[PDB]
Design a protein around this nucleic acid. Sequence first.
DNA 1: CACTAGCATTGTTTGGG
DNA 2: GCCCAAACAATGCTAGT
Length: 74
Amino acid sequence: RVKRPMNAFIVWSRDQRRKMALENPRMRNSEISKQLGYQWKMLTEAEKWPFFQEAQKLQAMHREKYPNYKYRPR
DNA sequence: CACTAGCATTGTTTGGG
DNA sequence: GCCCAAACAATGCTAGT
């Protein structure tokens, strides 16, 4: 079963989730998501663009590998 | 142990009104 | 066309059956 490709926030959140967890070892993971939300909204456009590029590469490789994939929720 | 449903985030896409 | 809700990507669990 073919999964969705990572958008830019997901791409950026992965390292940032681990680094928050190691520095705040008591927080629930659902509470790290909140902290990652505030931080992302704090990021300037100029800081987030490498992650949108990465998201694009990922959506592009997705269509290479799965040329007939289409998204079907529920 | 196996479901699956939910909590949490943003961005993307879908599907209904 | 507009609006909207909501699935679902990763990650890291929960809680119910």
